């Protein structure tokens, strides 16, 4: 279903890195330990990478297939398919520029 004649590899630009990212990871938090709902805005986040379970906002607001083309604006969490969590990338805004080890050693 996908057609492409070739693959390009190149240097990723900060602008296009932000283009890939759906949200900025600002906290090292992961989950609420007892409640395994991911934190905001941690490495695991429904507000950034998408909902954990199929087609429902992770706030208890919208739980249906009807709410799939519209994201939840009543809270940070958006509502889409869960497979989206396998594809959405994030970005971290480094305070100081950092050298790439591959281009170094």
């Amino acid at each position: 279903t996908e057609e492409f004649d070739a693959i390009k590899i190149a240097l990723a630009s900060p602008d296009m890195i932000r283009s890939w990212s759906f949200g900025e990871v600002k906290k090292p938090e992961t989950i609420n330990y007892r409640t395994f709902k991911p934190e905001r805005d941690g490495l695991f986040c429904a507000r950034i990478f998408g909902p954990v379970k199929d087609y429902e906002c992770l706030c208890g607001k919208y739980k249906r297939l009807k709410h799939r083309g519209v994201i939840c604006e009543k809270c940070g969490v958006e509502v889409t398919q869960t497979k989206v969590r396998r594809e959405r990338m994030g970005h971290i805004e480094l305070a100081s520029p950092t050298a790439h080890i591959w281009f170094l050693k």
Binding site: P28, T30, I31, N32, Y33, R34, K53, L65, K66, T82
Partner: protein
């Protein structure tokens, strides 16, 4: 050093080795110069009226019982009575000084700065006054730089000539005519941009009116400020750099208990700076003693947050530590094992909460660890994806959808149509009973009666047999 090194620990030790340790009186001398700097900045804020007006506004709010007393002031250099007396005499000094504006004025300013010398305020309020005076500096320099940009880029004259001619009143038309007097071409060119420059001068005069002091005194007072925080920051940085060894020594005790040593010393340096900002020698204690508790708190916070893979609250971490200590005590006393009954007895905590806490206290393990003690397979190679619908269930769902569509096709037009939107069958949306009734231009019991008729028709053992298999 330059020894083909790639460890930040090594050259961090190199950096800390440059600064020599201090003595007990050395800390007092450095804190004394810090106190001199902070007194200088307090005097600079003293000569600024508007920050004092803001402080008096918050004092009045506190008197109206709208703000906390301990959020404005902390201690004094010789309680609500002392605060009230000092703020009353301070308001008197402020008004008697302001009256001299709108010899004698210098004496009033000196007495005003003296009556602030008694005040010792909360770091937050002091930081607010510092930021207000800093934005005063920013606005003054912004007006000056706007005049710079206009006169230079619009009249094509070098930056060197401006400093001599403009400085001295800076808020009058004297320099306009003075520069024009030499019949310079840029003087003639200035006549086409004179309106904007004069409007900016008007804004500068408005800023002066807001401050209530002439702009020259504003520059004098803010330069005194700037040198004040420069001295204060230099002395504080000297203290922090000289006290890194304490942080390193304290953190290396916590390194054997997990977590990177470098993160520990960085957090300890943060706590050390916090202690330096809060340190005083009027207490009479040693700086090391005060900084020790701050560093321990920072280290504990770091272990609580950045060492646990999953977040655990600091109070929960302390509860875990207490549970572990009491467990060790009971283990060494009874000599066999920590029994949950005694653990429940020692705490106010029931016991189910104890076991759930014990479960929480353990950290997650990597999948990259080998399952079976160094088998060439990893743990994550066995973890089944539980978020994926089984193809058996997907085929069952497809067959059920086909059967429901066929059955709905087996019914009448309006009944099947109502059923499609009532439950969201074969469209990506679902509609309520009243929503379907509105489109069917019948909003009454009739729509629900149609739904019930469809249900009753489906009750027959000719359309339910096909759906009977799906639900057992």
């Amino acid at each position: 050093e330059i020894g083909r090194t790639t460890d930040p620990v090594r050259m961090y030790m190199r950096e800390m080795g440059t600064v020599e340790l201090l003595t007990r009186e050395g800390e007092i001398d450095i804190a004394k110069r810090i106190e001199d700097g902070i007194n200088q900045v307090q005097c600079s804020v003293a000569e600024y009226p508007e920050a004092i007006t803001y402080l008096l506004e918050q004092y009045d709010r506190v008197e109206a019982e709208e703000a906390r007393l301990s959020d404005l002031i902390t201690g004094f250099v010789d309680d609500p009575e002392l605060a009230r007396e000092k703020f009353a005499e301070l308001r008197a000094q402020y008004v008697v000084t302001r009256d001299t504006i709108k010899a004698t004025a210098q004496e009033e300013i000196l007495k005003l700065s003296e009556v602030f010398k008694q005040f010792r305020l909360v770091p937050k309020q002091f930081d607010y006054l510092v930021n207000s005076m800093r934005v005063m500096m920013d606005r003054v320099r912004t007006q000056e730089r706007l005049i710079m940009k206009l006169c230079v880029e619009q009249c094509k004259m070098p930056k060197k000539n401006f400093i001599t001619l403009f400085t001295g009143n800076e808020t009058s038309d004297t320099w306009f005519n003075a520069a024009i007097a030499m019949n310079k071409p840029w003087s003639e060119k200035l006549h086409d941009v004179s309106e904007e420059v004069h409007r900016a001068l008007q804004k500068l005069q408005q800023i002066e009116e807001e401050t209530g002091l002439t702009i020259e005194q504003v520059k004098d007072i803010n330069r005194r400020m700037s040198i004040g925080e420069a001295k204060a920051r230099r002395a504080k940085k000297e203290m922090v750099e000289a006290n890194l060894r304490l942080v390193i020594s304290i953190a290396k005790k916590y390194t054997n208990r997990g977590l990177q040593f470098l993160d520990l010393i960085q957090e300890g340096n943060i706590g050390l700076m916090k202690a330096v900002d809060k340190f005083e020698y009027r207490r009479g204690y040693k700086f090391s003693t005060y900084a020790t508790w701050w560093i321990r708190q920072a280290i504990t916070r770091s272990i609580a947050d950045q060492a646990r893979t999953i977040r655990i609250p600091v109070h929960m971490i302390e509860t875990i530590n207490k549970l572990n200590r009491i467990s060790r005590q009971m283990l060494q006393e009874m000599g066999r094992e920590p029994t949950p009954e005694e653990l429940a007895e020692r705490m106010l905590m029931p016991e189910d909460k104890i076991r759930k806490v014990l479960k929480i206290a353990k950290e997650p393990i990597s999948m990259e660890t080998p399952i079976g003690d160094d088998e060439d397979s990893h743990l994550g190679d066995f973890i089944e994806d539980t978020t994926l619908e089984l193809p058996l269930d997907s085929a069952t769902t497809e067959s059920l959808r086909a059967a429901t569509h066929d059955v709905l096709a087996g019914l009448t037009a309006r009944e099947a149509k109502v059923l499609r939107m009532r439950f969201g069958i074969d469209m990506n949306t679902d509609y309520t009973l009243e929503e379907v009734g509105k489109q069917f231009d019948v909003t009454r019991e009739r729509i629900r009666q149609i739904e019930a008729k469809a249900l009753r028709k489906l009750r027959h053992p000719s359309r339910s047999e096909v759906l009977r298999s799906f639900l057992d």
